[PDB]
């Protein structure tokens, strides 16, 4: 029961969805991990006297 | 298109009726989940006040 | 038949996704919930 037989039945078309999902997930994970590391290892503000 | 009811025969094909049923069920489930999520969010922190 | 089922499904899905993203961003930027570090 599909309206996209060319996307949901073909092996090539069926791999589009998974590839896109994994790419989006990996991009988000990369950004999150980098900024978490930066904000966790960076020093505290340089206070005044 | 013999699975379609008499009223909606001029509008729906046999293959789209099942997908329409799936979409309706998904919409109802999403509505239930959204209702529970909104109730939990209000129970945590009211946004109107 | 005026509207293909495929067109209706695609339009509704895209509108729902865009609205969900917009609502999430607007609720984050308001600074009234204290979620994700205040």
């Amino acid at each position: 029961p599909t309206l996209f037989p060319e996307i949901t039945n073909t092996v090539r078309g069926r791999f589009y969805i998974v590839a896109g999902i994994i790419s989006v997930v990996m991009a988000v994970a990369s950004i999150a991990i980098f900024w978490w590391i930066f904000y966790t290892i960076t020093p505290a503000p340089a206070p005044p006297l | 298109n013999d699975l379609v009811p008499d009223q909606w025969k001029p509008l729906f094909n046999n293959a789209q009726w099942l997908v329409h049923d799936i979409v309706v069920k998904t919409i109802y489930g999403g509505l239930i989940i959204a209702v529970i999520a909104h109730v939990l969010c209000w129970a945590w922190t009211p946004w109107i006040r | 038949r005026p509207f293909e089922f495929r067109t209706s499904v695609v339009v509704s899905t895209l509108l729902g996704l865009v609205m969900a993203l917009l609502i999430h961003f607007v609720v984050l930027s308001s600074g009234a919930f204290n979620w994700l570090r205040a």
């Binding site: 949901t8 069926r14 969805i17 999902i21 | - | 204290n34 979620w35």
Partner: peptide, 26 residues
């Protein structure tokens, strides 16, 4: 309740995507 709500939403997202992906790819 910041972590708990995030965990709940992420779990819902993962379970829903698993269900829909299983429906599509079968």
């Amino acid at each position: 309740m910041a972590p708990f709500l995030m965990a709940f939403f992420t779990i819902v997202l993962i379970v829903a995507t698993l269900y829909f992906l299983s429906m599509i790819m079968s």
